[PDB]
Write a protein that holds these residues in place. Structure first.
Motif: not given
Lengths: 63, 63, 63, 63, 63, 63
Positions: D11-18, D33-47
């Motif tokens: 769950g990693v995002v490393h190295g981005v240029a925009t 509902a509206v969801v725009t402009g999502v960038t360079a996001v990461a997560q980890k969920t357990v259970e």
């Protein structure tokens, strides 16, 4: 309205996308000229000798 | 309204995207010229000799 | 309204995105010239010789 | 030495240029509902139920 | 030395370069779901339902 | 030394370059789902139903 040289688009480079994963590159020059890896270059010269990537290995004028 | 050179776009580089993951590069020059890795360059020269990436390994005028 | 050189966009570099993860680079010069890693450069010269990335390994005028 | 889950990179995002020069953006939502402009996001969920960019316009349980 | 799940690289996004000069974008939602412009996203879910960009316009359970 | 799942690279996106000069985009949803512009996304799900870009326009269970 005359528009002599009104709306031109000259000497232009627009829109480029490049990737290079594992590019080993190795040069070994001895007394010469070397020009590698030129990308996305532009220019405009008026009344002159414009060379983007020239390579003159030597110039000699002995007397 | 004459628009002699009114709205031009000359010597321009706009819009570039580049990636390079693992690019080993190695140069070894001895008494010469080397020009590597040129990107996204622009210029305009009026009444002159404009060279983006020139490489003259030597110039000699002996007397 | 004459607009001799009114609204130009000359010698311009706008919009660049670059990444470089693991780029080993190694140079070894002996008595010469080396020019590496040039990016996002622009200029304009009026009545002159403008060179972005020149590399003259030597200039000799002996007498 | 067992190394059950020892050295991971998850769950990693490393190295981005925009870049974004002139990006007009316009939304007009009515009851949704509206969801725009999502960038360079990461997560980890357990259970758990992990959703990065979900959009449920409505949920209704009438009785 | 067992290395059960020792050195993994899972759910990863590394190395991205993006440009956007003039990108008009316009949405008009009425009672639904909309998901635009998702970039450089990563995750890892263990024992769960992980959806990066879901869009459920409605959920209804009437009684 | 067993290396059960030792050195894997799973659910990965590495090395991307993108440009978009003039991209007009226009959506008009009414009571549904819309998913546009998804790029450079990755994930890994263990014991779950993982959908990157799903779009369910409706779910209805009436009684």
């Amino acid at each position: 309205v005359l528009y002599v040289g009104s709306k031109t688009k000259e000497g232009v480079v627009h829109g480029v996308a490049t990737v290079a994963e594992k590019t080993k590159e190795q040069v070994t020059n001895v007394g010469g000229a070397v020009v590698t890896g030129v990308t996305a270059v532009a220019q405009k010269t008026v009344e002159g000798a414009g060379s983007i990537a020239a390579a003159t290995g030597f110039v000699k004028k002995d007397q």
